[PDB]
Design a binder for this molecule. Structure first.
Ligand SMILES: NC(=[NH2+])NCCC[C@H](N)C(=O)O
Length: 225
């Protein structure tokens, strides 16, 4: 559709991040679909909480950036077909990037609410490579994270973000881990457009399918994953 404005908050590696240009897996997917569509595009970096309101007001045409498709979000916006698996977010101090793998988290302590699906996911995906500390609640896990007693926390992101905001901690940020274990697959990550924008949605879906078909998608995946 010749001109398309995308927005994200560039704070979620490896999906999106700051290279003063937005970079990352999602940024490359967006550039690739735009090329496929013969569209001219920009990616704007804006506060996470402003994105959906701005999409609804029509300031942007599309949102992306490690955005998990969820039933709740599907009530507010329309998503494309997913272009990668869903992400489990780890919350950690921004001063130290983490590689979210068995080797990258070697010697780290990860806090989690005990007995939850997040706890099971950590056990299955990391096994004995990490130390898991379990808490009665996400708040208790965060009390340890933000006093330096664990390295990262895994839990419900909207609740965690709410806690961090209420308690005036901007120091802690999210890192995305793609879920490769089919037992924990969700709908995936997708590009969001304004609810009812069927024309753009169809164009984006066709473009995503086309980059999958011509090898462009596979090369982008190989770059990051
Ligand atoms: N661009 C970003 N800051 N993305 C954060 C995404 C966090 C999480 N995956 C979610 O779907 O809510």
């Amino acid at each position: 559709t010749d001109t398309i404005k995308f927005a994200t908050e560039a704070t979620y590696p490896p999906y999106v991040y700051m290279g003063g240009q937005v970079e990352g897996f999602g940024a490359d997917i967006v550039k690739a679909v735009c090329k496929q569509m013969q569209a001219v595009c920009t990616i704007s970096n804006q506060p996470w909480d402003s994105l959906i309101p701005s999409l609804k007001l029509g300031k942007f045409d599309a949102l992306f950036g490690g955005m998990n498709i969820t039933t709740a979000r599907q009530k507010e916006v329309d998503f494309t077909d997913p272009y990668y698996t869903n992400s489990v977010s780890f919350i950690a101090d921004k001063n130290t990037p983490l590689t979210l793998s068995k080797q990258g988290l070697k010697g780290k302590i990860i806090g989690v609410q005990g007995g939850t699906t997040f706890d099971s996911y950590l056990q299955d995906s990391f096994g004995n490579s990490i130390t898991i500390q379990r808490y009665p609640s996400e708040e208790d896990a965060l009390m340890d994270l933000t006093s330096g007693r664990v390295d990262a926390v895994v839990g419900d992101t909207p609740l965690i973000k709410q806690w961090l905001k209420q308690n005036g901690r901007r120091e802690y940020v999210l890192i995305g881990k793609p879920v490769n274990d089919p037992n924990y697959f969700g709908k995936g990550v997708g590009i969001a457009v304004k609810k009812g924008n069927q024309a753009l949605l169809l164009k984006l879906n066709k473009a995503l399918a086309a980059i999958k078909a011509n090898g462009v998608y596979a090369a982008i995946v190989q770059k990051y994953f």
